[PDB]
């Protein structure tokens, strides 16, 4: 228990360290989807339209 916390903790070191490139992938991909959907909802606004009041 006393000395086992190091080698047992290494599993948490790998499990928490493996999330770096993952959160990199999410923060690099979700903004690409953000500009994809952003331009998709932006291109809906067309020039031909009717004027109301």
């Amino acid at each position: 228990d006393l000395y086992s916390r190091y080698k047992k903790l290494q599993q948490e070191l790998e499990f928490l360290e493996v999330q770096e490139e993952y959160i990199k992938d999410e923060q690099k991909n979700l903004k690409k989807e953000f500009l994809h959907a952003q331009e998709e909802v932006k291109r809906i606004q067309s020039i031909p339209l009717v004027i109301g009041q």
């Binding site: 690409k32 500009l35 994809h36 331009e39």
Partner: protein, 286 residues
Amino acid sequence: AVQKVVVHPLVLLSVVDHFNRIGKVGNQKRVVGVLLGSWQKKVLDVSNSFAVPFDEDDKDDSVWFLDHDYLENMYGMFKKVNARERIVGWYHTGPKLHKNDIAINELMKRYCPNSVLVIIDVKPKDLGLPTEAYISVEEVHDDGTPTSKTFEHVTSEIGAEEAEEVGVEHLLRDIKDTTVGTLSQRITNQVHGLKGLNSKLLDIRSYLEKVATGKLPINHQIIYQLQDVFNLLPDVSLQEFVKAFYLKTNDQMVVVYLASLIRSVVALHNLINNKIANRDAEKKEG
């Protein structure tokens, strides 16, 4: 006569259909399709096309098989359902320009008006633009060779008018739009060197090969203009362009001031909320 043409991807996807309905017979020869378009306006615009049974011979290259009744029936029905588009020319999927193409194109030169020729690749491995508009016009040669059919390269562009952009964008869901900024620019700035490296490197090998090991004159007159244009930039010493480097570098300094100053303005809300929010959430948490 024609400066540029417009080719829609519908005809190339019809070539994908030509490669789909083969049936695994083992022939996959240069299937000739009848290209359709609008020859009225100065610019050429291909909307759709169809196919015609075309078969050649293994040994003899001068063998070509066409059909007039099927062309007049498909053109009659297609003209009946849509009279805004008429016959313009044809196209073959063969990557190599054979000698029989003057006899194949000569039929649509006699019966039909001047036909445009397009050479594509059977395998989508070519990085360059697959469509090349080759007009069928006779040009006078200076060396004295008899007048023959000459295929002059006409520039082409791949664009869609109203709906094919929406259909392609919906079917892909992977390609990205223009999206001016960092990624769409740096990708071009990284892969462009390969986009020119594979083409130029792929051309200079057969070029240098046919320079020494070449016969059957290939109009060596144009090579003088080739090396001449290659020598139109004789390694300028960049002495006069130093002031231009000072101007572009000054604009770089302007971008530096805009980045540092504007980002310094953006740091306001972050470098304030990080304090006023943390100290109030901490003093009011318990």
